[PDB]
Write a protein that binds this ligand. Structure first.
Ligand SMILES: [Mg+2]
Ligand SMILES: [Zn+2]
Ligand SMILES: [Zn+2]
Ligand SMILES: [Zn+2]
Lengths: 193, 100, 294, 98, 44, 33, 46, 105, 115, 463, 54
DNA sequence: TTGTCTTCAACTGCTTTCGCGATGCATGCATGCATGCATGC
RNA sequence: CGCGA
């Protein structure tokens, strides 16, 4: 009837080869509309980075639905359509009230976007009684819940113990349950079942 | 995104229509009494906010005097966009526009 | 119609009423005597009549049609047919007092929403098409021939009060330091300081030394990153460099409002003009006042 | 008013429309069913016109916004009317079209 | 003796919770008498 | 000029609010909010 | 007369495009008197 | 400028979707989460999402009563005279919606 | 110019709500500079110079158990001209609930004065 | 008791599993009691509870288990608990934060808030941090804000400050990634206190306050600053980030002479520090687009640096200072022609600053200057006597003291002749600001004490 | 906090996002971090560890 | 029957700029003089 | 509907 589901990720992380995981790192061309401080009028690219981009680096974003790994191809859009894209001078509409210029900029973001059901690996910094901690790519902190752990496995004093009886170590394949961006930090919820 | 990529393509086309080419630019070569003001004003704000300043200050503590001082040299880096009533506009570099 | 949203008659029905947020409905204190917002009262009447029909219609509904006498209808089923007028009328009063029934043929109607906007102002031309402002001073003009025509005499009073903060840069820091050091009490002075975060620091309650602190402390970076683009703003007293905008009401034509370079004149409390302006402002220097805007 | 707080977005145009009750309920922070105003303690009567769900009041923090009196923008509530009421401004249009 | 009958001029002093009136006349309006105290004025 | 209340909206006090009629409210070191 | 216009104004679902100063005045934008006709556009290296 | 600054200038949240000044409000956040503005009209009761595919973590937000709301997260800051707000308040009482078309879209 | 100001702290009362407040200091702490302007009974000394914000009265409150103060509102410095202790009818028993105060204000021929 | 309490809280969890949460709250009530209230949860129950909560933490996670978690985290003086309780507490915090690194933020907030304490109470905190930071890298950003959001006010007591600052130094080594905004936060408050004093000459307080922290810092600095740190250590980048903050933050401050000795202090720890710090000052002074007043003060800092400094190869000093004279010689050529042109002598102010620089250089002459042959380096006697009577007349325009200083020992050393031309200055004798510019030498005998003696090696008594 | 100074006004993906090979990621992280040589400092610290993964 | 311009005539909106500036009626405490009730010797 | 051009 009524679709609010028009916000969804139709890109799915494909299971890679040679490997069993999926690539959640992705390049998204985007358009943002930002401000330019008056001091950077001689370094507009340099400014926008310091002014806008750089803070986004390695933080989650709702639009892209991931953590920003970095950016490529920053392009300020000259106000004049007539000017060829080669022109070294571009035009920035100044705010009527204030000296700050506002403009559109095109840039390519590399973003790691874990979805649900994605297959991932990560090292284990701590095996708790409740869970298993995971640094994903030595950055993203992931956790595997107790109930999510198959009950046949055990934890001793300490360290976990699998079905085969050994403790488990280091890189661990797991399936994503949820991704928690509500906290200041991303939290990747994986599951082994 | 395609819907956004759409009206971005729509943004250009209309804004292509609304631009008047240099040769096609039909309005007065003079700087209107108003254009002079706001230029001085806008340039003054930026000068006040530590925008780069092309001409020596020589003891001007007043950004607006400074803005005036650049304008004598046409060192002001701005562009006036003159709207015809339809919304199609022109673009005049400051320096190319005859002062008073 | 691009949305292609259909037209629904529910428009004219005016069912539920939107309650203005508390802050616009705040009470009214006349002297120390306080009074609830008049509009709240007009709301209350609806609220009263609301639960009335709510509860009243509830009882007749509970009344069993067999247990209901056909007279038990005429006492109630006809009774709702009255209050319906009130609840429909209370709505009117709440909006248009003119569409409201007379209360005791006198006591005046309480102004409705419609009356707040319209009559003789009621709002648009009171608080929108014109407004009371800031950094403006009204006082009495005095003829001074010695200033220049474009200039304007400013009493030190206004010199001390009015303040136009200047974006802390380079060229200005030589002044603004001294401008801060001087004090709100000593012209050319300075009053507040806007840090980069937007916080204000008043200089009023400060002696000179820990004030000289701020002056020296003034131009310096700030660790906060979002503020790296910004510089401190100081609120200097108006000074001879500044321009004001003078107005003598009524304003018949634009020339009755002109800009003036400021000359700060010591010793007196009156705005003072050269004569060339008089013909424009049409000002006789008989108890004349003019509005200074900064 | 400060130039250091640039306002990026701007209002191009304003559209006139009528609030539909379906909207009004969804967008109402509270319902006001109670003609009562203030208790004896002076606290706002819940369900009354001053209910803190409409915003902060006195020192009492906002229910809805949660902010104090200074920063709480205020929030608008709805009064459900037992009867559909003729919108007085229109009415004539109602009257004519009917 | 801080006070004066607003009528008979009789000088008087009062106390906390005291009838405000002239102990002689009874006029309930009273004046506060000025007492020796140092106040500065410039002759300009 | 005192009212003690409302500490100070600056986390290097909290130092101690008096309100001026102009509504700045002022704390001793000299925040005006 | 506000409402009578305002009424008719709503009845047409009238979009107001903010041209007249009084309109612009209300919203709080710039005006089309003069000092608000031409747009100031900066320039920049690249 | 003079008029605006001497008569009321702030800036305000508006839903670039629901096109309203009033329906916006702060979010009551979690520990570990900053508050944010959301538009009430364009926000839904969280109950509705799980009724009918998974829901984005951030789209949920909680009111002063902690009620999880989904959507209504599209807001800007626009500089208006304050009385404009009060004006809408009045027209809202009359049931009259003012939709504010905002750029950038 | 003489502006005569009436200070009544019994207006709030409801003609029986028992006396809440009393012109004077309380035993509590109070800034003690008030002694300069205000006399020992909480009233100001006759003829005392006054500028804005200075104490024009000292009334102790029982409820708040505070010694509170009325201050001089006008920005133009005035003098204390007269102080009038006003008792009330209904057979005494009523302490001082109201005072009227003349302020004396110097007026000279300042610039701007119509003659 | 123990078995009761266990089954009590285990039943409570099922209440939250059944959404009741009442016992959860009541439990959360007890644990939220202050450290003072005897009704606070006893250690053994908390011991039981922690491990139970550390058993399945995912049984807790919900809006309902939330309030419990707060009281847990908001439990006061957790660092004062018996170690096993403290361990299980720590062992618990590790679990939840690793499960949902949401609470770590206000956990860290508390950890940050504790930095006001001395080192001992804060060790577990630092221990807690230096783990999670490396483990939860994204923490680095907002924890810094907590370093920012929590700093003691100036007016606040030193007890927090000097212990807080020290705690920062404590963490500073634990995370070199931040490494910067620390100093930024430091130097500001450091400056913020510095400027308070100068105009005063509460005084005794900030005097003590500041002195406690500076000597705290310079010590921590001289500790972290060592030649072995100049190679594989980070002192290089640290020396860099200090110079930048000096350049960015310290240089622009006005008449501030309290913490600019810091770089003076450290750069005297090593001559490379001296060198690498010296090349910067020269680059700052002669930069083209910088403000002449900045240039002037650049030669005021650099100027008043050298001859109050101790550890520096003297020969390093002379050449560029002699190139300065060459710089002065290239200066005099293009300019004396402008002297007679329309304008005043203050047009040349950058010279007199460089000349005010050299009359301070004259301080070293008295000590050691006359080479082996006695001759003055680069023919000083003839060099100045020409430049002295030059259209600059540099004697007239510079400081009242150091020019008179330059006056005495020069002719005593037979450098040049002044008092004759000095009298020629007084008889012939933007304006006042200019006077104030040079007069201040941002090095001078300190009014402090312990750090003052720390500089005794570093300082040259004028006597 | 978040203002128009530090924050974009509005952001839109112009296209459907494109997955990337590790080499590209390597090339990027290489080039990206390289091009970066202050909040920049704290985050690239992660990136170094992130490329250290690969 | 019936069309409609015809006519008079019931409703209804605004007005040169700013500052200086509720009535009546029942309830109960208040006052004063004279019996009763409680403390003390 | 009082005071000022
Ligand atoms: Mg006249
Ligand atoms: Zn008497
Ligand atoms: Zn404070
Ligand atoms: Zn919305």
């Amino acid at each position: 009837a009524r679709f609010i589901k028009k916000h969804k990720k139709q890109v799915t992380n494909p299971i890679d080869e040679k490997n069993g995981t999926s690539n959640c790192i992705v390049r998204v061309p985007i358009a943002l509309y930002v401000s330019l401080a008056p001091m950077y009028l001689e370094n507009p690219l340099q400014g926008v980075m310091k002014q806008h981009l750089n803070p986004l680096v390695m933080k989650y974003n709702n639009k892209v639905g991931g953590v920003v790994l970095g950016y490529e191809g920053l392009k300020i859009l000259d106000a004049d359509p007539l000017s060829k894209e080669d022109t070294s001078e571009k035009l920035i509409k100044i705010t009527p009230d204030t000296p700050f210029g506002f403009t559109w900029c095109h840039v390519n973001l590399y973003v790691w976007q874990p979805q649900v059901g994605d297959v991932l690996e990560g090292y284990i910094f701590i095996q708790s009684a409740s869970h298993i901690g995971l640094l994903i790519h030595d950055a993203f902190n992931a956790s595997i819940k107790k109930n999510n752990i198959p009950v046949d496995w055990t934890f001793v004093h300490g360290h976990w113990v699998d079905s085969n009886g050994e403790p488990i170590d280091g890189k661990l394949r797991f399936t994503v349950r949820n991704v928690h961006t509500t906290g200041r930090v991303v939290s990747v919820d994986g599951t082994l079942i | 995104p395609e819907d956004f990529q759409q009206h971005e393509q729509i943004r250009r086309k209309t804004l292509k229509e609304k631009a008047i080419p240099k040769d096609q630019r039909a309005t007065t070569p003079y700087m209107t009494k108003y254009e002079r003001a706001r230029i001085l004003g806008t340039r003054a704000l930026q000068i006040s906010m530590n925008a780069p300043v092309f001409v020596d200050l020589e003891g001007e503590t007043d950004p607006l005097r400074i803005a005036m001082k650049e304008l004598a040299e046409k060192k002001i880096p701005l562009v006036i966009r003159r709207y015809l009533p339809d919304g199609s506009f022109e673009d005049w570099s400051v320096e190319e526009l005859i002062v008073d | 119609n691009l949305s292609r949203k259909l037209v629904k008659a529910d428009s004219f029905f005016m069912d539920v009423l939107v309650v203005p947020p508390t802050r616009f409905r705040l009470p009214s204190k006349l002297g120390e005597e306080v009074h609830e917002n008049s509009q709240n009262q007009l709301l209350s009447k609806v609220l009263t009549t609301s639960l009335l029909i709510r509860d009243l219609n509830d009882d007749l509904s509970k009344l069993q049609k067999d247990k209901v006498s056909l007279e038990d209808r005429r006492v109630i089923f006809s009774r709702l047919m009255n209050a319906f007028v009130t609840i429909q009328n209370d709505v009117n009063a709440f909006i248009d007092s003119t569409k409201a029934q007379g209360r005791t043929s006198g006591k005046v109607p309480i102004p409705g929403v419609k009356q707040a906007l319209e009559k003789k102002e009621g709002l648009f031309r009171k608080h929108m098409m014109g407004k009371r402002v800031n950094y403006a001073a009204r006082s009495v003009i005095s003829p001074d021939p010695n200033i220049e025509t474009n200039e304007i005499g400013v009493p030190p009073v206004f010199a001390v009060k009015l303040t136009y903060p200047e974006p802390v840069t380079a060229y200005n820091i030589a002044e603004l330091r001294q401008a801060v050091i001087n004090g709100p009490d000593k012209w050319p002075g300075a009053t507040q300081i806007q840090n980069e975060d937007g916080s204000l620091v008043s200089l009023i309650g400060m002696s000179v030394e820990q004030r000289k602190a701020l002056a020296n402390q003034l131009l310096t970076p700030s660790s906060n990153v979002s503020t790296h683009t910004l510089n401190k703003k100081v609120y200097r007293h108006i000074k001879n460099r500044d321009v004001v905008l003078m107005n003598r009401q009524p304003t018949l034509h634009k020339a009755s409002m002109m800009g003036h370079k400021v000359r700060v004149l010591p010793n007196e409390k009156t705005l003072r003009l050269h004569y060339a302006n008089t013909g424009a402002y049409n000002a006789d220097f008989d108890g004349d006042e003019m509005n200074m805007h900064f | 008013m400060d130039i250091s707080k640039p306002v990026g977005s701007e209002i191009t145009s304003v559209d006139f429309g009528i609030l539909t009750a379906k909207e009004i309920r969804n967008l109402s922070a509270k319902q006001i069913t109670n003609p009562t105003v203030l208790d004896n303690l002076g606290h706002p009567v819940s369900g009354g016109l001053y209910d803190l769900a409409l915003g902060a009041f006195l020192r009492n923090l906002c229910s809805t916004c949660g902010l104090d009196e200074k920063f709480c923008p205020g929030h608008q509530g709805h009064i459900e009317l037992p009867v559909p009421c003729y919108n007085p401004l229109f009415f004539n249009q109602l009257y004519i079209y009917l | 003796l801080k006070y004066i009958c607003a009528e008979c001029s009789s000088k008087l002093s009062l106390s906390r919770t005291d009838a405000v009136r002239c102990k002689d006349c009874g006029h309930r309006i009273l004046l506060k008498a000025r007492t020796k105290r140092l106040v500065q004025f410039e002759a300009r | 000029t005192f009212i003690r209340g409302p500490i100070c909206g600056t986390d290097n006090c909290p130092s101690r609010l008096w309100r001026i009629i102009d509504g700045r409210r002022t704390c001793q070191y000299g925040h005006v909010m | 007369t506000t409402c009578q216009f305002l009424t008719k104004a709503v009845l047409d679902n009238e979009r107001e495009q903010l041209d007249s100063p009084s309109a612009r005045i209300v919203v709080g934008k710039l005006n089309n008197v003069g000092t608000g006709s031409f747009d100031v556009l900066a320039k920049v290296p690249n | 400028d003079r008029l605006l600054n001497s008569s009321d200038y702030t800036q305000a949240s508006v839903c670039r979707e629901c096109g309203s000044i009033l329906t916006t409000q702060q979010s009551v956040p979690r520990i570990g989460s900053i508050s944010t503005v959301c538009c009430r009209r364009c926000s839904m009761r969280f109950e509705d999402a799980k009724k009918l595919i998974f829901i984005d973590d951030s789209q949920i937000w909680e009111d002063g009563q902690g009620n999880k709301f989904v959507g209504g997260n599209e807001t800007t800051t626009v500089a208006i005279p304050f009385v404009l707000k009060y004006l809408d308040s009045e027209l809202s009482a009359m049931g009259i919606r003012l939709r504010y078309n905002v750029e950038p879209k | 110019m003489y502006k005569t100001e009436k200070v009544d702290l019994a207006l709030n009362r409801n003609r029986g709500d028992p006396i809440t407040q009393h012109f004077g200091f309380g035993n509590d702490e109070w800034p003690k500079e008030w002694l300069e302007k205000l006399d020992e009974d909480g009233l100001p000394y006759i003829g005392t110079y006054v500028e804005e914000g200075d104490p024009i009265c000292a009334y102790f409150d029982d409820t708040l158990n505070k010694t509170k103060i009325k201050t001089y509102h006008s920005s133009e410095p005035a003098y204390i001209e007269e102080v009038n202790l006003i008792g009330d009818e209904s057979n005494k028993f009523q302490e001082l609930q109201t005072v009227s105060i003349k302020y004396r204000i110097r007026r000279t021929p300042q610039i701007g004065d119509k003659f | 008791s123990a078995a009761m309490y266990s089954r009590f809280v285990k039943s409570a969890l099922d209440d939250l599993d059944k959404n009741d949460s009442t016992q959860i709250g009541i439990i959360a009530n007890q644990v939220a009691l202050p450290s003072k209230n005897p009704e606070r949860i006893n250690d053994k129950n908390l011991n039981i509870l922690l491990d139970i909560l550390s058993s399945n933490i995912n049984r807790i996670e919900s809006s309902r288990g939330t309030f419990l978690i707060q009281s847990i985290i908001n439990f006061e003086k957790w660092w004062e608990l018996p170690p096993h309780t403290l361990s299980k507490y720590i062992y618990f915090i590790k679990i939840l934060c690793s499960s949902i690194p949401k609470w770590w933020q206000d956990v860290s907030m508390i950890l940050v808030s504790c930095f006001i304490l001395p080192i001992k109470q804060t060790v577990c905190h630092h221990d807690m941090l230096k783990y999670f930071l490396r483990m939860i890298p994204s923490s680095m950003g907002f924890i810094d804000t907590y370093l920012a959001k929590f700093f003691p006010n100036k007016n606040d007591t030193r007890r927090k400050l000097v212990n807080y600052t020290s705690n920062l130094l404590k963490l500073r080594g634990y995370c070199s990634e931040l490494g910067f905004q620390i100093w930024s936060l430091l130097i500001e408050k450091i400056i913020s206190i510095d400027v308070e004093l100068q105009n005063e000459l509460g005084i005794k307080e900030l005097s003590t306050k500041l002195d406690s922290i500076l000597t705290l810092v310079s010590t921590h600095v001289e500790e972290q600053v060592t030649p072995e740190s100049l190679e594989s250590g980070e002192g290089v980048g640290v020396f860099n980030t200090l110079t930048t903050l000096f350049k960015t933050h310290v240089l622009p401050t006005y008449y501030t002479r309290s913490i600019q000795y810091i770089m003076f202090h450290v750069s005297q720890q090593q001559l490379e520090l001296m060198d690498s710090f010296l090349v910067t000052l020269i680059d700052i002074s002669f930069a083209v687009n910088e403000a002449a007043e900045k240039k002037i003060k650049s030669l005021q800092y650099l100027g008043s640096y050298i001859a109050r400094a101790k550890k520096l190869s003297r020969t390093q000093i002379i050449f560029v200072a002699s190139y300065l004279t060459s710089w002065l010689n290239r200066y005099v050529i293009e300019r004396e022609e402008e002297v007679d042109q329309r304008g005043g002598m203050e047009r040349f102010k950058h010279f007199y600053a460089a000349f005010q620089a050299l009359c301070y250089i004259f301080c070293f002459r008295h000590n050691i200057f006359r080479d082996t042959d006695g001759n003055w380096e680069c023919e000083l006697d003839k060099f100045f006597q020409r430049m002295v009577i030059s259209k600059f007349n540099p004697l007239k325009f510079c400081n009242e003291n150091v020019m008179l200083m330059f006056a005495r020992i020069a002719q005593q050393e037979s450098v040049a002749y002044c008092f004759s031309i000095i009298e020629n200055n007084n008889n012939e004798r933007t304006r006042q600001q200019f006077i104030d510019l040079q007069s201040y030498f941002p090095y001078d005998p300190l009014f402090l004490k312990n750090y003052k003696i720390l500089m005794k090696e570093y300082y040259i008594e004028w006597s | 906090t978040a203002t128009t100074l530090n924050t974009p006004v509005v952001i839109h993906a112009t296209q459907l996002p494109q997955h990337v090979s590790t080499d590209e990621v390597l090339q990027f992280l290489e080039s990206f971090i390289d091009e970066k040589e202050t909040n920049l400092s704290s985050s690239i610290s992660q990136l170094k560890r992130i490329q250290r993964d690969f």
